[PDB]
Design a protein around this ligand. Structure first.
Ligand SMILES: Cc1cc2nc3c(=O)[nH]c(=O)nc-3n(C[C@H](O)[C@H](O)[C@H](O)COP(=O)(O)O)c2cc1C
Ligand code: SF4
Ligand code: SF4
Ligand code: SF4
Ligand code: SF4
Ligand code: SF4
Ligand code: FES
Ligand code: FES
Lengths: 230, 66, 108, 117, 207, 28, 427
């Protein structure tokens, strides 16, 4: 009742009528690459990394924002999907500078755990690499806005849960930027909690800045006691 | 007290094995028989997310500034 | 597909699919799983009741010499409810063929 | 391409070519490297402790082939053999000094070999 | 170029005309109420109309008028083309160089303008008020590489008009807001007539 | 061809007659 | 195709280019049979466009007789509106700005008429601000007859009688595709939506609306008036109608004209009136569309008719219907690189193929016109053109590889000698 069997790689599963292709393929234990998407946020689509070749169609669709019709064959690995996940993640790895000796998210960036598995082998660009300038906002958010692959993820968070309407999009085409037009500081509750959301190492912590790389720590779970909600 | 190294006693201190499930999780701790304590697996909500309802006529679920 | 990819072959994948098949046919007493590796290797999973005679059957024949005992090893596997795994490896002299014998057990 | 004593290099007029990117640590088979870093007050990160367990050092030389900014170099001088175990643990202020007893010895061997590798 | 404001005029200030406060009532009555909430496209244009170029305090003025967050104002005027943030001149003139306008020899309606006037390429005048930029996609590539102005368009541009439109505007004239020569209506020219008549028996709508 | 006289466009006739509107609610 | 015509007469959808361009008294065509058209049911008008089969001259098919009847719920709880575009995003179209120049009263008829097919509430039209002198005449036409009580809110004969409001952008982009203009009319920046939410007549402004072109509803009164079996007089069984054309480039009279379907380019362009370049014995690289239809050389294209499928029988279709040539003076790679240069200044920036993928091509096409290093760069450039078709959202992603990929075809030594000449220059 209230379901459609969709053959994800030729294998049945029953979802709600009106869910997403992403949640369907993640239900059967698979990962499609995720840049312009978050579960705890709204949904946009302006990275165009999830691209699956749907069966009985010459075109390619993106799994972020579309419903699922009567049961398709969501052909995950094809000889054309790998001509797309290689495709998009060759452009955005060009207009970007050669950091990571010094990029402080250097052990967990999503241009670094996608780029071994998916994507191409070498480069053919071979000169270019625009370089914008940075600024300061508060004494907590160490700020390199050069890297900033414009996935529109920090931007919606101002309209999301933290209701401070502060950020925007300034520019057109190749040249757009993310930071505040005026030099207004941005600080309230949750204001230091953006540096987890930024999926590359363009945003990071100010006191933590130059200490140690994230493959030497020992992750032990615990609880903080500085408030009554735990 | 010569370098500041993390020299130590506590001879085990680094032993992690790879279990398959909760079923044989207990059965290994009892077969050699020392005390233990068990957590629980947390799986999240499924959950209900749908684009299109982010543009309303009278609702509150409405995004801007995208 | 290209250079710098290992060129596999089907001739040895055929006969090792052929030879080990009628091994379980002629001793359905001890053999519990046979599998063919995708690179010309063979496993004959054996419950250790037949630890002696199946070796003794491969000790001598006219279609299987197999008198070169190369490798006795031991592999532990926790979370199996029978931990350990004794694995042999023997060689046919006249035929140039490798086959292993996987026999599980427990401690006591 | 002969291996030997450790040393550290630097740029023209002294800069500490090391950037403390920790890669030589994670490939040392004997874990003879130990590095604690810190943001120096100018802003660029540098090192505070820097260790090579010359006892433990098994001379796989992978530190020479792992640094992106080409900092640590196996210097070709077999001059050794002190008299205590307490001495061969090299701190930082040996290594910059030991990297500055000579450089023209080092700087010519890299410049004759960097085309191959 | 750069798109920020490093705090020269944070509060200029700026106010609207009492003739122009009542015109908002015509604007707000257009939109469906509740979702009305943003009429920022004609209104901030009208602030550009009163001032000529608007400061950042002029952006902050209208945010309290239409109860939006003021960050949602910076998104608009830093995106579109006709809005201005830097100080501008009196006459804003545009060379409509486009790829079919390139085929109509835009090089003639390129320089010999800077030599005639005394300015640099893509640059305002050093004195007061002439500002020269280049635009694309305003209708007729079927005319000459034409010239846009503040309130009209100069069809049929030519190196004579280079010696005229720059010249007559330095004197303070209005050099022919339209096609200055040739076809005044951009007619097919050999098909311009097409037998001008009543359109052959209206009243076919029985159907 | 006149830069001003948008009140002739906006406030002259379109303010006299909208009509009506009702425009709905959508409060929200 | 018929008898290869597509002629030019007075029996067209135009009142007069020269008759009277200001407000008037609605002499011959305007408001002829007003109340009799709307007195019939919508089912008389729904399917009446099927007698015409007007595909929509914006640059794509999917005819207006289908998108208005189908993909149209009756009502659920919320109103419906009409979006009539008027802005020209394609370079060198000029099909608009002349309809509003001398025919202001024709468009106001099909607004209530085409809205009666939907039953929508009001009428919102969008004009570019830069067309500022001509747009002032539009509200004067509202002052002419709408303010004369001919329309709204009960005029005439029925309760269905409504208004028309005028808005303006500044420097926008949402001419080129729908669902951004319904976003920009709210007040957001103009970064268009995903194309299948709920597409545009399910998820719209606050309630589902319809979007049409100018002549999608400007011909709607007269095609409801003269009807037939006349709207399919030229062309094959696929396409039907008589569209406005525009001629630019290298010609004796760069001007507009009126024709119909299935006319070959050798007679269509050279008529009305002159072929001032080498009309033959030049290169005469023709462009069938506004920008999304690449170069076609001096081959049989001149005898190929202007059907939608005839250019699909060629390498690229064209529905924008723009004519520009490049015969003798124009370098081929020089002009088209400025077309690619153009797209840097109108891309939105949402899609990661579109953003940073256009300026991949910008930096390399400026390298070829200069004349530069060794080939096989062409094929790597050709794979990028084979890498952005269906990955973006808007048709600009399709409008970015089609001029590039059509240059790869038909011109192999366009730069294979030119970049060799620079390689000969350094050597
Ligand atoms: C490159 C390009 C430019 C376009 N420019 C416009 C335009 O300027 N104005 C417009 O109304 N439609 C334009 N369109 C077509 C839109 O898709 C169209 O307006 C919309 O789909 C409605 O279709 P219709 O023309 O049948 O009404 C353009 C399409 C393309 C591919
Ligand atoms: S901070 Fe950087 S990665 Fe995060 S949403 Fe903004 S641009 Fe994207
Ligand atoms: S954030 Fe990603 S792209 Fe940037 S340095 Fe780290 S791994 Fe590289
Ligand atoms: S050699 Fe490389 S990893 Fe080692 S300290 Fe120097 S920069 Fe860091
Ligand atoms: S010299 Fe050898 S032991 Fe020492 S850090 Fe380098 S690889 Fe490791
Ligand atoms: S192609 Fe991409 S950047 Fe361009 S308009 Fe469409 S979504 Fe926006
Ligand atoms: S993953 Fe977010 S759009 Fe493809
Ligand atoms: S595009 Fe330059 S005027 Fe038409």
């Amino acid at each position: 009742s209230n379901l459609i069997e969709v053959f994800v790689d030729g294998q049945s599963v029953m979802v709600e009528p009106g869910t997403t292709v992403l949640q369907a393929c993640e239900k059967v234990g698979m990962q499609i690459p995720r840049f312009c998407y978050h579960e705890r946020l709204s949904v946009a689509g302006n990275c165009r990394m999830c691209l699956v070749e749907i069966e009985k169609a010459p075109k390619v669709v993106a799994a972020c924002a579309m419903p699922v019709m009567k049961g398709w064959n969501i052909l995950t690995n094809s000889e054309k999907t790998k001509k797309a996940r290689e495709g998009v993640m060759e452009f955005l790895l060009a207009n970007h500078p050669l950091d990571c000796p010094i990029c402080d998210q250097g052990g967990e960036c999503d241009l670094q755990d996608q780029s071994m598995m998916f994507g191409s082998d070498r480069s053919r660009f071979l000169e270019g690499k625009r370089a914008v300038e940075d600024k300061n906002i508060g004494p907590l958010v160490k700020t390199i806005m050069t890297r900033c692959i414009q996935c529109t993820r920090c931007i919606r968070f101002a309209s999301e849960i933290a209701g401070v309407d502060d950020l925007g999009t300034t520019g057109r085409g190749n040249d757009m930027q993310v930071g505040t037009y005026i030099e207004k500081m941005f600080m309230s509750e949750l204001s230091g909690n953006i540096i987890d959301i930024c999926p590359v190492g363009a945003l990071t912590s100010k006191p933590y800045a130059f200490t140690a790389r994230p493959w030497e720590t020992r992750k032990t779970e615990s609880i903080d006691v500085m408030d009554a909600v735990g | 007290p010569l370098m500041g190294w993390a020299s130590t006693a506590d001879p085990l201190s680094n032993l992690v094995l790879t279990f398959s499930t909760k079923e044989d999780a207990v059965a290994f701790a009892e077969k050699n028989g020392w005390s233990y304590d068990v957590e629980e697996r947390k799986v999240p909500k499924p959950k209900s997310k749908s684009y299109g309802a982010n543009f309303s006529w009278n609702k509150r679920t409405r995004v801007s500034t995208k | 597909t290209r250079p710098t990819v290992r060129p596999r072959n089907d001739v040895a994948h055929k006969q090792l699919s052929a030879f080990g098949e009628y091994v379980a046919e002629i001793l359905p007493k001890y053999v519990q799983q046979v599998q063919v590796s995708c690179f010309n290797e063979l496993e004959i999973c054996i419950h250790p009741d037949g630890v002696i005679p199946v070796l003794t059957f491969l000790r001598d024949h006219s279609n299987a010499q197999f008198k070169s005992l190369a490798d006795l090893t031991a592999v532990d596997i926790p979370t199996r409810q029978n931990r350990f795994e004794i694995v042999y490896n023997l060689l046919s002299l006249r035929f140039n063929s490798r086959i292993r014998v996987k026999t599980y057990t427990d401690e006591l | 391409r002969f291996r030997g004593e450790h040393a550290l290099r630097r740029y023209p007029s002294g800069e500490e070519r090391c950037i403390a990117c920790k890669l030589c640590e994670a490939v040392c088979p004997a874990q003879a490297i130990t590095i604690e870093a810190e943001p120096r007050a100018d802003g660029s990160r540098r090192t505070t402790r820097y260790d090579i367990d010359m006892t433990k050092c098994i001379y796989c030389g992978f530190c020479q082939e792992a640094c992106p900014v080409d900092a640590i170099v196996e210097g070709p001088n077999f001059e050794f053999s002190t008299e205590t175990h307490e001495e061969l643990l090299y701190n930082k202020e040996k290594l910059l000094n030991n990297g500055d007893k000579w450089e023209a010895e080092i700087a010519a061997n890299i410049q004759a070999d960097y085309l191959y590798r | 170029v750069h798109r920020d404001t490093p705090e020269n005029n944070p509060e200029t200030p700026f106010d609207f005309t009492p003739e122009n406060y009542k015109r908002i009532e015509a604007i707000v009555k257009n939109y469906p109420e509740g979702h009305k909430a943003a009429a920022v496209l004609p209104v901030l244009d009208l602030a550009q109309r009163q001032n000529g170029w608007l400061p950042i305090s002029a952006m902050n003025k209208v945010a309290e008028i239409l109860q939006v967050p003021p960050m949602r104002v910076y998104e608009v005027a830093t995106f579109y083309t006709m809005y201005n943030r830097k100080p501008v001149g009196k006459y804003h003139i545009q060379v409509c160089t486009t790829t079919p306008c390139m085929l109509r020899n835009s090089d003639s309606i390129l320089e010999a303008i800077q030599k005639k006037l005394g300015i640099k390429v893509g640059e305002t005048t050093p004195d007061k008020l002439f500002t020269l930029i280049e635009v694309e996609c305003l209708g007729a590539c079927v005319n000459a590489p034409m010239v846009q102005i503040n309130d009209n368009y100069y069809e049929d541009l030519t190196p004579k008009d280079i010696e005229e439109i720059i010249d007559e505007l330095k004197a303070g004239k209005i050099p022919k807001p339209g096609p200055r020569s040739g076809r005044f209506s951009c007619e097919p020219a050999g098909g311009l007539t097409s037998l001008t008549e009543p359109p052959k028996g209206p009243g076919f709508g029985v159907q | 061809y006149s830069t001003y006289t948008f009140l002739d466009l906006n406030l002259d006739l379109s303010k006299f007659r909208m009509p009506q509107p009702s425009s709905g609610r959508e409060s929200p | 195709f018929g008898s290869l015509k597509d002629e030019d007469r007075i029996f067209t959808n135009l009142y007069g280019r020269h008759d009277w361009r200001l407000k008037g008294a609605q002499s011959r065509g305007d408001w002829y049979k007003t109340k009799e058209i709307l007195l019939k049911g919508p089912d008389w008008i729904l399917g009446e466009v099927k007698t015409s089969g007007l595909r929509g001259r914006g640059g794509a098919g999917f005819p207006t007789g289908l998108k208005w009847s189908f993909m149209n719920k009756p009502s659920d709880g919320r109103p419906k509106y009409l979006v009539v575009n008027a802005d020209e995003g394609e370079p060198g179209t000029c099909k608009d700005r002349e309809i509003i120049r001398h025919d202001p009263h024709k468009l106001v008829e099909g607004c209530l008429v085409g809205g009666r097919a939907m039953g929508a509430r009001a009428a919102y039209i969008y004009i570019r601000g830069e067309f500022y002198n001509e747009a002032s005449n539009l509200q004067v036409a509202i002052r002419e007859a709408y303010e004369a009580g001919l329309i709204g809110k009960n005029a005439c004969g029925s309760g269905y009688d409504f208004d028309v409001f005028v808005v303006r952008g500044a420097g926008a982009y949402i001419c080129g595709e729908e669902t951004a203009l319904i976003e920009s009319i709210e007040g957001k920046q103009g970064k268009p939506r995903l194309k299948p939410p709920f597409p545009a007549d399910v998820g719209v402004f606050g309630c589902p609306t319809t979007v049409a072109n100018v002549e999608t509803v400007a011909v709607s009164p007269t095609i409801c008036r003269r009807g037939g079996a006349w709207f399919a007089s030229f062309g094959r069984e696929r396409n039907s109608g008589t569209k406005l054309f525009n001629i630019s480039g290298h010609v004796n009279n760069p001007c507009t004209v009126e024709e119909e379907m299935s006319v070959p380019l050798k007679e269509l362009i050279e008529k009305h009136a002159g072929g001032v370049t080498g009309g033959w014995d030049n290169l005469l690289a023709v462009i069938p569309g506004g920008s999304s239809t690449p170069l076609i050389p001096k081959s049989v294209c001149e005898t190929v008719l202007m059907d939608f499928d005839a250019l699909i029988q060629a390498q690229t279709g064209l529905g924008t219907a723009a004519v520009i040539v490049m015969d003798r003076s124009t370098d081929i790679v020089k002009a088209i690189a400025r077309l690619i240069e153009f797209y840097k200044h109108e891309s939105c920036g949402q899609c990661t193929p579109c953003r940073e993928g256009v300026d991949w091509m910008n930096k390399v096409m400026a390298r070829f016109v200069r004349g530069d290093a060794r080939p096989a760069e062409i094929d790597s450039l050709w794979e990028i053109s084979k890498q952005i078709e269906g990955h973006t959202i808007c048709a600009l992603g399709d409008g970015a590889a089609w001029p590039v990929q059509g240059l790869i075809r038909h011109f192999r030594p366009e730069l294979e000698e030119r970049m060799q000449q620079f390689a000969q220059q350094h050597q």
